[PDB]
Design a protein around this ligand. Structure first.
Ligand SMILES: [Zn+2]
Ligand SMILES: [Zn+2]
Ligand SMILES: [Zn+2]
Ligand SMILES: [Zn+2]
Ligand SMILES: [Zn+2]
Ligand SMILES: [Zn+2]
Lengths: 153, 153, 153, 158, 153, 153
């Protein structure tokens, strides 16, 4: 019964739309459709801030209200916005639906007014082991981002 | 001390940045810098949805949780997002700072994940005696808009 | 064998890529892939100027070096930039490939450094009985545009 | 011209008689639907061919209901703007009892709000008199007789 | 409130009726009444295609939009159409009510226009260990099938 | 990406070569180069049969897997092999590139093993109104034809 949407833009052909649905105080369903991607897996994250005054750089780090480390969406040691990878087909198109419970549209940890970012490289899920594997996953640069806003229904 | 920001973009040269700063549950400070505007007063409103899948059109009507008619920011009978006019100088720049009490960053009426819209025309503050005066003003088309998102501090 | 590309952007979810191919003094082949569109036909035109200082507005009118009225790509009585309609499916995705002779990549009428615009409405092809049919084809507002640029191969 | 995702469905038409056949449907993107019909065992001559509302054969073909009619208009000819969506006119069976015809229509999409997937095809006993012919039943049915064979429109590969 | 029905027919005495009811976007309630069956358990699956051009064989493999291996309705690792076994009494009648969440009547994965097949042999769920166990369940031949079609109310 | 070719030969000096390209479930790109033609427009069609036992006469009518009438590539109450006109220059050369949806190289309506015919006269696109306007277009005799055959890469 609550809904949000993010329009994803950047400097390249990578652009897309992410819709969010949440019932009850339950899981959040995320419908992701992005194009222009290099075929393969891309880091896909909900970042802390809905600030685009400085391009996608101003969206900050992965949304992490539990001071925890970077992981996979399945394992209990992740950031709230650690939504893993989205995979682009041969046409650079990634269409996927993701269900997660650390990203509510309400409550103290609402991600409303926050951001989504799709990334340059594959998320190594915090096993790289890279220096950066445990903060970012190595997902690389920020290809496109958008601020999460309220939308009808 | 909570703070939010909206980056305003559109179909024209008109763009700008709006920052929001709020005390406790005190009044909200709205800092506006917009460029590309025709010199003169322009309707400046906080609209209901942080949706821009269809441009500024998807941000809906003026934010109105009291279900009242359109008027001026000083009026008793006003929309919450009815922030009146902002004035552009000869260089097309409207820089102004606004304080209002119906646009909190938290609570049952939070404006996070909603939008700002700068309009084609002067807002008649519903006294115009125009068909649209009591809903719109005659604020005209949507020159630029942005989703209100969270930002540090 | 020269090649060009335009990355199509705007204030909405409407995004796209246009690639252009032309050998010597032959026809020009245009691959158009746009997403985010309202399902149905949309005016798709090559406009005179590659200028986005004023959004898609500064790209001017349809590219028309033969001083003619608005028509269909098939009509001898068309603008050079009259590339007809592109049709979006139910998911809002329109992909189409077009061959034309009036939009070369070289010579006195090169379209390099000009722009592409995808439009709000159906192009009535100049046949709709409307005031705007012979200049634009109705087709409405400018959803997204991009400057046509040179690209390798 | 335009790139096209191919969408496809099929109905196998069976009934109490020798009348049986196969109907395939092709639609690219959201354009018109191409319908290929091959039915056998028919009485030579024209036969009513309609897309009926339900893919329900629990009670023989009669449970497929009336003609698919999401506009609410009366029975007419495929040519007529006075149509059921499923008003596909007549198929004519030759002397060997075979009716083979190809049809293009725009009121029978395989996707969308008016999807015909999971609905049915029915070939009928008699001639469809279209919205003409002046019978009590002409504006519902087309006085098209009984239901000889029917099938549920189902998904099929590619 | 959506409802569907499949009439199950085949080469032998095996015939039956399956009605499907689904409210909301949730579990599907499926009522199965099949007769002529051998007394004992028989595999009951929702197959991919509503194609019966070549008899029940044309219905394809078990409906599997998660590209996963054969399991039980209880396992988490199943085909969507993995609805387990139905057991026929000594009179050859199998009557059962079954509820599952992977067979919606609407959505990207609607099972409308697909089919049901009741099988020759017992479905070793996936975990019996045989050649075909992780594809079919060695459910054996296809005794009767029917295309899932729309029905009133 | 599949590719095909027709080598076009005939009764006169008229000869030419046609190559076909088709990716995916996309359009077919047809490259046409014919010589020996009288300057002007000439009907260019994909006819039904790849049979030249009796010269071009044995290639049959225009390829028409829809039950439709003769017309023009843009208007589509047309045959699949309705490719409009090709224009010969002063030197009798017609070089043209064509992209179409009704001539796939694969699938049930493949044009592989069928033929291309270049015709004596201009195609009237279905509009003489002439006896032949709705079947052939009054394209005249068959100047040269070739069977559409598979070619590497
Ligand atoms: Zn992280
Ligand atoms: Zn107002
Ligand atoms: Zn024009
Ligand atoms: Zn009817
Ligand atoms: Zn299975
Ligand atoms: Zn023809």
């Amino acid at each position: 019964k609550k809904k949000a949407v993010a329009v994803l833009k950047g400097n390249s052909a990578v652009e897309g739309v992410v819709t969010l649905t949440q019932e009850e105080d339950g899981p959040t369903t995320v419908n992701v459709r992005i194009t222009g991607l290099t075929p393969g897996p891309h880091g896909f994250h909900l970042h802390e801030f809905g600030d685009t005054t400085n391009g996608c750089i101003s969206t900050g780090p992965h949304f992490n209200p539990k001071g925890l480390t970077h992981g996979a969406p399945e394992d209990e040691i992740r950031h709230a916005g650690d939504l893993g990878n989205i995979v682009a087909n041969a046409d650079g198109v990634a269409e996927v639906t993701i269900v997660d419970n650390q990203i509510p549209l309400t409550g103290p940890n609402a991600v409303v007014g926050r951001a989504f970012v799709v990334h340059e490289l594959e998320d190594d899920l915090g096993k790289g082991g890279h220096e950066l594997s445990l903060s970012t996953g190595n997902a690389g640069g920020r290809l496109a981002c958008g601020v999460i806003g309220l939308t009808p229904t």
